[PDB]
């Protein structure tokens, strides 16, 4: 198979497809609540800028490398999204995946509307994000963390990027929920993730697909996503304050 | 042998009551059996023991059916 790795069995069916325990029932909640979030900046020591984001069952680590050599008059922004194999129900192929490339592009088309590349001619920035655990809304964490990393690494941006997530209940009276989990996401019909700049009041990225076809549900999904991005901001406000207080006090 | 009754031990066609070959250990296989056994007998009738077993019932019957086939 692969000549750059250790070869094992040719085929391997995971025991979930043989799991004799039938799928359970998620439950119910209040759709006007947010999972408590803890944010830390400046984690890694050998990286120019890094951040680690954890909230509930989600574990994502983001690090930012500095500008390197090689729309010029402007600098590029390389991106790379990759998630840990030990995340989720099943294992994943190390070489890659179409899902990883789609989410990498959904990240790239969302963090460039914030930084001003008209200050780095002929240079380029590389951003790497890693998901240690998938326990809820993921794209609402790969955006917040990769923006926090950029802000702690001293690159010039117009504003931050704060993400959120939503999902649609499958009942006869569906209602959108805020910060869904895997028990509330694999049983859902549609999902929406928004990327809002809280001060400039401009939507940075949008993505959504599913079974909701009336153009009156998406207005609430969008505007509660905007309320989520305006309610997650203060924690990231005090996180960069503490990060800069410690970095400056370290001199 | 004692896997069967006396009546099934005779050599009626030659009027004997027991008949085998021993004159050919080279071109046959029951004769090497007979060689091992006769030499075991001449070596055991000294009141000692012949380490290393010789045969068993099922082994001998499958050998003799094999030899009949061949």
């Amino acid at each position: 198979g692969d000549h750059r790795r250790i070869r094992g069995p040719e085929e391997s069916q995971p025991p979930q497809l043989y799991a004799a325990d039938e799928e359970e029932a998620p439950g119910t909640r209040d759709p006007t609540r947010l999972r408590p979030v803890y944010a830390r900046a400046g984690l890694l020591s050998q990286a120019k800028g890094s951040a680690y984001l954890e909230a509930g069952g989600t574990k994502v680590l983001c690090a930012v490398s500095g500008p390197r050599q090689a729309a010029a008059l402007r600098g590029r922004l390389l991106c790379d999204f990759r998630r840990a194999p030990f995340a989720g129900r099943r294992r994943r192929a190390p070489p890659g995946g179409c899902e990883e490339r789609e989410l990498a592009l959904a990240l790239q088309e969302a963090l460039e509307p914030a930084v001003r590349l008209g200050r780095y001619p002929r240079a380029q920035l590389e951003v790497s994000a890693l998901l240690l655990e998938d326990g809820g809304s993921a794209l609402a964490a790969a955006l917040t963390a990769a923006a926090l990393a950029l802000a702690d690494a001293g690159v010039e941006m117009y504003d931050l990027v704060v993400g959120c997530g939503l999902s649609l209940a499958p009942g006869p009276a569906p209602t959108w929920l805020l910060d869904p989990t895997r028990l509330e996401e694999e049983r859902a019909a549609a999902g929406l993730t928004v990327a809002l700049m809280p001060v400039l009041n401009q939507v940075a990225g949008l993505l959504g697909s599913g079974e909701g076809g009336l153009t009156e549900s998406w207005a609430e999904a969008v505007r509660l996503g905007l309320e989520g991005c305006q309610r997650l901001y203060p924690v990231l406000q005090q996180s960069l304050v503490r990060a800069a207080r410690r970095r400056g006090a370290a001199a | 042998t004692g896997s069967c009754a006396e009546e099934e031990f005779h050599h009626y066609g030659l009027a004997l009551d027991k008949y085998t070959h021993f004159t050919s250990p080279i071109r046959r296989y029951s004769d090497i059996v007979v060689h091992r056994l006769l030499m075991a007998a001449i070596s055991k009738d000294k009141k000692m023991e012949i380490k290393g077993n010789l045969f068993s019932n099922k082994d001998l019957e499958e050998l003799c059916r094999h030899i009949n086939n061949r």
Partner: protein, 141 residues
């Protein structure tokens, strides 16, 4: 082609043996041929001087089995004895020659050639009563 058909059909092998099935041979080399180790001469009871052994044998009998001997003793009576070759020293139990013999149960004969149970010099010099060289045997008496 017909001989080959007769072989294949009647379940008889025409494959000479392998290295480890060959190598386990008594070394009848000219620089050192076979000759009896004297402790076995002690342990046995020679008769190559005091009694006569010969054999009639079919035309082409490159490998003798049958031998006998009848003489008279210091009284006048006729001692009877039949002497059959004792080939048990070159087939050890659970050997490769022994499994081989266990497989090829019976020597097959078609009327041009024979088919040696053994390799083709182990008995076709060393076991056949020829010449007047020494030869292990078993003489009932």
């Amino acid at each position: 082609g017909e001989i080959a058909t007769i072989l294949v059909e009647n379940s008889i092998s025409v494959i000479p043996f392998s290295e480890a099935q060959m190598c386990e041979m008594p070394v009848n080399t000219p620089e050192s041929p076979w000759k009896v180790s004297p402790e076995e001469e002690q342990k046995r009871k020679d008769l190559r001087k005091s009694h006569l052994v010969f054999s009639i044998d079919p035309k082409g009998c490159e490998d003798v089995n049958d031998t006998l001997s009848v003489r008279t003793l210091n009284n006048g009576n006729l001692e009877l004895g039949v002497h059959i070759a004792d080939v048990t020293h070159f087939v050890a139990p659970n050997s490769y020659i022994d499994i081989e013999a266990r497989t090829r149960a019976t020597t097959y004969y078609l009327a041009d050639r024979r088919y040696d149970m053994l390799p083709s010099v182990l008995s076709a010099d060393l076991c056949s009563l020829l010449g007047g060289v020494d030869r292990y045997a078993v003489s009932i008496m």
